[PDB]
Design an enzyme around this catalytic site. Structure first.
Site, PDB file in Angstrom:
ATOM      1  N   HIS J  22     -90.610  -0.837   9.537  1.00 32.14           N
ATOM      2  CA  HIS J  22     -90.979  -0.997   8.143  1.00 32.14           C
ATOM      3  C   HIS J  22     -89.698  -1.077   7.326  1.00 32.14           C
ATOM      4  O   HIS J  22     -88.713  -0.382   7.637  1.00 32.14           O
ATOM      5  CB  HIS J  22     -91.859   0.170   7.690  1.00 32.14           C
ATOM      6  CG  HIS J  22     -93.260   0.095   8.212  1.00 32.14           C
ATOM      7  ND1 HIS J  22     -93.553   0.075   9.562  1.00 32.14           N
ATOM      8  CD2 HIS J  22     -94.450   0.015   7.567  1.00 32.14           C
ATOM      9  CE1 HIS J  22     -94.860   0.001   9.727  1.00 32.14           C
ATOM     10  NE2 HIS J  22     -95.428  -0.051   8.534  1.00 32.14           N
ATOM     11  N   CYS J  34     -90.755  -5.806   2.454  1.00 29.39           N
ATOM     12  CA  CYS J  34     -91.929  -5.829   3.336  1.00 29.39           C
ATOM     13  C   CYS J  34     -92.852  -7.026   3.035  1.00 29.39           C
ATOM     14  O   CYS J  34     -93.164  -7.832   3.925  1.00 29.39           O
ATOM     15  CB  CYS J  34     -92.697  -4.511   3.168  1.00 29.39           C
ATOM     16  SG  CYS J  34     -94.126  -4.292   4.231  1.00 29.39           S
TER      17      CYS J  34
END
Ligand SMILES: [Ca+2]
Ligand SMILES: [Ca+2]
Ligand SMILES: [Ca+2]
Ligand SMILES: [Ca+2]
Ligand SMILES: [Ca+2]
Ligand SMILES: [Ca+2]
Ligand SMILES: [Ca+2]
Ligand SMILES: [Ca+2]
Ligand SMILES: [Ca+2]
Ligand SMILES: [Ca+2]
Ligand SMILES: [Ca+2]
Ligand SMILES: [Ca+2]
Ligand SMILES: [Ca+2]
Ligand SMILES: [Ca+2]
Ligand SMILES: [Ca+2]
Ligand SMILES: [Ca+2]
Lengths: 7, 106, 100, 7, 106, 7, 100, 7, 106, 106, 6, 6
Positions: J22, J34
């Site tokens: 992430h 992201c």
């Protein structure tokens, strides 16, 4: 010439 | 930790070995792994010079913890046999003192 | 010096072998017999038909694999290279092996 | 197919 | 497809170029991409020989579809400039005839 | 010397 | 010839630079100033304290990175190598750059 | 720190 | 074919093992190279977690023949010797079932 | 950090893209590196499938920041130029968001 | 474990 | 699509 605690 | 970084060409000849760092197993004057690697290193270089016609290019830090060997004549079988012997000797140490010496290839 | 340039792809297959240069020369005979025999072996003993190019004058031969997933042709290339490597070990100055 | 002094 | 396999050392000098295969765009006598690559190849080698002091080691298959250039003096700037010129010229072809010529590095 | 249909 | 051995790890970080050999020598001055200045820069301008070893006699200097995720120390190593590369481009015979 | 003929 | 993609870093540690595909030796429920590789991988991961401090980053596709192991503590000797053991095991399968599993390093 | 592991084969084709981790730029629902990388990857895969004959082998972890793309037809120029475009895009994010995404080739 | 995962 | 997958 040789060092025995070189490393 | 002592780092041993070994360059092998694609024919399996050893062109460079760099040993760097301090073993950290004891304090200066009483570290086994250090003595082990030191004796093997210094003796192997002595052996290359005294027993072969190869004259490697050698550099080191006076203050210790840093030595560099570079081969000139990679076609000297004797100097190479001596380098693999040294290698298998520090290898031998690494097997029992994983945490204090590491060999790294190419 | 004979130079042996070997290409291995991502899947561990030998795609390319190029032999180039020159070693009554016995290192030459050694490498010649291993090369020519291995090619003979690949074509006579496997399915694979490698793409082959060579110079009429000598010192130059190039094998390219077509079917890189032919295990037999691969085993025979590995054995060829083991053999040239075997000669190199005693005639260090007259062959160079190089991986790409 | 073979020439023994090819290399 | 013509394959162009180009070896560059870690300083960006071109040590080897191998051209192999046939373009397959036309039939023999009328294939453009072939002519394109042929003219660039043969002329570049001619140029290296006629304009520089570098004498590359050259091998090819009479029957065609296979040519190998290997540099001797990698420190000849002129021969190298000529190799990058040839490279960008076959590059130029590849851009419009993707399917007929491929350049492959190292 | 130069073959234009070499490749 | 000065040899410059550069190690880049799997994450694209420079872990090791070794400079060894010798080029009133101006290629030497060039490479010396770039090396010493870059090290000065890393220590004076970043967080990173590289592990440094060199031979008193010259022709040998070795930098090892400690914090390979220090972007600044990395940018400065990249710029050092760009600079030595810049000299190499005009003095091809007197420096070799080598990646490991 | 610097020696200009170190290399 | 099961593909085993292994990443070994400059210090000789395994950072990454990705195993993808199906053996295709049998059909699902009776494939034996599959069972072989499945037991080795799941057991070795179980061993890492149950026997070491290391908690690798794990991703797998619920039901799809994709498992990805990524090391966090590359300096954990035990987790490392476990990964070396896993690969020695998958290697041992590959030796006799070449066409069903392939291991590729770096 | 998002890691982007890219495999380019000897013919210059992208065989493998694995994206894992992430961004850690924001917290989930408002991370912008992201979203950037997510849009690029999902869109590019959509584009490959909707605009080419190529059907890549896809594995992702239901809900875990692991996506693995593997090419089947490495000779599909369109799927390739789509993957090159995807990487140019993720590269363009990396240029300004170095600490959130890293692209590593081969 | 799933013994048929690969 | 899941825009927060990475
Ligand atoms: Ca003797
Ligand atoms: Ca030296
Ligand atoms: Ca390769
Ligand atoms: Ca047979
Ligand atoms: Ca051919
Ligand atoms: Ca040799
Ligand atoms: Ca090589
Ligand atoms: Ca001129
Ligand atoms: Ca030749
Ligand atoms: Ca590396
Ligand atoms: Ca600062
Ligand atoms: Ca040091
Ligand atoms: Ca140079
Ligand atoms: Ca190199
Ligand atoms: Ca993960
Ligand atoms: Ca898959």
């Amino acid at each position: 010439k040789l060092n025995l605690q070189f490393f | 930790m002592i780092t041993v970084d070994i360059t092998v060409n694609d024919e399996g000849k050893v062109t460079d070995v760099i040993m760097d760092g301090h073993a950290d197993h004891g304090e200066y004057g009483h570290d086994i792994v250090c003595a082990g690697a030191s004796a093997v290193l210094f003796g192997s270089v002595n052996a290359i010079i005294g027993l072969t016609s190869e004259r490697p290019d050698i550099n080191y830090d006076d203050n210790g913890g840093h030595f560099h060997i570079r081969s000139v004549d990679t076609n000297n079988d004797e100097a190479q046999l001596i380098l693999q012997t040294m290698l298998v000797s520090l290898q031998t140490i690494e097997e029992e003192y994983n945490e204090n010496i590491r060999l790294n290839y190419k």
